[PDB]
């Protein structure tokens, strides 16, 4: 099912954004630790410069040049850690920008699929309502009306069978009944 | 609109069939009354 596949992809994206958060947090700690290293190396370089100033105050140029050689080593080590730090800063920004783009892609994809699923479900529900409003039981109603019409045609056939059979004397008896009714009208005229 | 049309179709079909059934039953009842008023026992009376 495509809805279950895209939901699983969104779940997998929750694991991926947690992995990229960990990678950012690690990179942030590496830049902060290499800053801490070069900061303390440059403070030790100041201590060795002050050790050289004490040696020069005592006239010991040999010890002053030796102390300045410690200063050189420390400031060169701090420049190496600044070069390493520059790679951490660019990687930290690369992971930051990748995470911001990843979250935007996840959010847009999830919400677009969700509203597409909702509108597709509403559209097929309306289509099934229009289909079921068209697809009425008119053939079953017509079949009931056809059974009643067959019983009406049986009464018509029964009426035809009676009509061909019922040739009788009674029509001449009705003419005698009308003559008897005429005698009662003549008796009514006599009474009047 | 489909529901309004569906309810109209159901109501009209039901009431038309009901009155057709009632009139058909009344018509066959009258036809059987006229048939039984014709179909008297005149052959049994004639045999007596």
Swiss-Prot record, chain A:
It is a peripheral membrane protein. Disruption phenotype: Essential, it cannot be completely disrupted. Cells with very low levels of protein have no ordered thylakoids, are barely green and are non-photosynthetic. Keywords: Cell inner membrane, Cell membrane, Coiled coil, Membrane. The lineage of its organism: Bacteria, Bacillati, Cyanobacteriota, Cyanophyceae, Synechococcales. The keyword DNA-binding does not apply. The chain holds residues 24 to 215 of 267 of the full protein. It is found in: Cell inner membrane. The keyword Transmembrane does not apply. This is Membrane-associated protein Vipp1. Belongs to the PspA/Vipp/IM30 family. It comes from Synechocystis sp. (strain ATCC 27184 / PCC 6803 / Kazusa). GO terms for cellular component: plasma membrane. Its main location: membrane.
Curated annotation (Swiss-Prot), chain B:
This is Membrane-associated protein Vipp1. Belongs to the PspA/Vipp/IM30 family. It is found in: Cell inner membrane. The chain holds residues 120 to 167 of 267 of the full protein. The lineage of its organism: Bacteria, Bacillati, Cyanobacteriota, Cyanophyceae, Synechococcales. Disruption phenotype: Essential, it cannot be completely disrupted. Cells with very low levels of protein have no ordered thylakoids, are barely green and are non-photosynthetic. It comes from the Bacteria. Required for thylakoid formation.
């Amino acid at each position: 099912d495509p809805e279950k596949v895209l939901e699983q992809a969104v779940i997998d994206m929750q694991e991926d954004l947690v992995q990229l958060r960990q990678a950012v947090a690690r990179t942030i700690a590496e830049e902060k630790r290499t800053e801490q290293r070069l900061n303390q190396d440059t403070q030790e370089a100041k201590k060795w410069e002050d050790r050289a100033k004490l040696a020069l105050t005592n006239g010991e140029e040999n010890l002053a040049r030796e102390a300045l050689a410690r200063k050189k080593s420390l400031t060169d080590t701090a420049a190496a850690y600044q070069t390493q730090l520059a790679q951490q800063r660019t990687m930290s920004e690369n992971l930051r920008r990748n995470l911001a783009a990843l979250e935007a892609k996840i959010s847009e994809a999830k919400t677009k699929k969700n509203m597409l699923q909702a509108r597709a479900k509403a559209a097929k529900a309306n289509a099934e309502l229009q289909q079921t409003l068209g697809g009425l039981g008119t053939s079953s109603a017509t079949s009931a009306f056809e059974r009643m019409e067959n019983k009406v045609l049986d009464m018509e056939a029964t009426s035809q069978a009676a009509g061909e059979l019922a040739g009788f004397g009674i029509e001449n008896q009705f003419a005698q009944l009308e003559a008897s009714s005429g005698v009662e009208d003549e008796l009514a005229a006599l009474k009047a």
